[PDB]
Amino acid sequence: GVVTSE
Amino acid sequence: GVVTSE
Amino acid sequence: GVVTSE
Amino acid sequence: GVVTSE
């Protein structure tokens, strides 16, 4: 799946 | 942080 | 995830 | 048939 981290 | 598990 | 076809 | 998506 997708993890985005900022 | 993050952990995803599939 | 896990799938089995018999 | 088996199709898996994660």
Side-chain angles (χ1 to χ4, degrees), chain C:
Chain C
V2 152
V3 178
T4 71
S5 174
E6 250 143 329

Side-chain angles (χ1 to χ4, degrees), chain A:
Chain A
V2 180
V3 183
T4 64
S5 163
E6 297 165 54

